[PDB]
Design a protein around this nucleic acid. Structure first.
Length: 189
RNA sequence: CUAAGAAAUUCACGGCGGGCUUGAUGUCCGCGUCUACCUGGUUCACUGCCGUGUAGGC
């Protein structure tokens, strides 16, 4: 009733398995696919496949109702792989209630950028640009890693995804997707 | 209840100096070292509508 279709993809094993890079190419091809389609009406999740909360799953599930799904990256609208997945076909969802959330976050682990932005913003001096308020004392960080090289005009990002409150508490009908490529309230298993 | 039981050695010095080891020599001949490999599980990156304001953006 929220977005009632799912694709239980299973990335097969392969003697080349950089998971950051496999999910990088997959999420990047998905980015290309949905910016070619166009629309803030799509869902993406990652079911309970992260055993620890360090790794990330070897699976995926896309949540678009009928038309965006069948027209977007699917059996039509080429993936360009069709061999490394051998995936299936979607169908209607059951009735769970884990409160349905996923999230994107990014942190700061390179104060060179911040000091350079200070130097650029109002022509800061080197001594204060060195000790006004960097975070040289401690380097923040985030656990779940995916690489996702730049869509264009850039270089290797390192994107972080935190599963939101997945509590068996309630449910609500909210927006379709936040960010750009990531649904909002999404059914979870 | 110890062949027990005890015990101040203490003082100084000129080893001196001289010298031909000499000549000579043929190491001399060989040699199959092979064979196959994923550096990949990682580059926390230039910005900026930013909030320098530790959450905030592709």
């Amino acid at each position: 009733f929220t977005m009632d279709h799912y694709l239980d993809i299973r990335l097969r094993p392969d003697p080349e398995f950089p998971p950051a890079q496999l999910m990088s190419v997959l999420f990047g091809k998905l980015h290309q696919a949905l910016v070619a389609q166009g629309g803030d009406r799509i869902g993406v999740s990652f079911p309970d496949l992260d055993e620890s909360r360090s790794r990330l799953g070897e699976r995926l599930r896309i949540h678009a109702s009928a038309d965006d799904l069948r027209a977007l990256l699917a059996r039509p609208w080429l993936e360009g792989l069709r061999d490394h997945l051998q995936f299936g076909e979607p169908a209607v969802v059951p009735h769970p209630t884990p409160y349905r959330q996923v999230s994107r976050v990014q942190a700061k682990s390179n104060p060179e950028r911040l000091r350079r932005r200070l130097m650029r913003r109002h022509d800061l001096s080197e001594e204060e640009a060195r000790k006004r308020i960097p975070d040289t004392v401690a380097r923040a960080l985030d656990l779940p890693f995916v690489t996702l090289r730049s869509q264009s005009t850039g270089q290797h990002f390192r994107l972080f995804i935190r599963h939101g409150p997945l509590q068996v508490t309630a449910e609500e009908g909210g927006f379709t997707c936040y960010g750009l490529s990531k649904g909002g309230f999404v059914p979870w298993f």
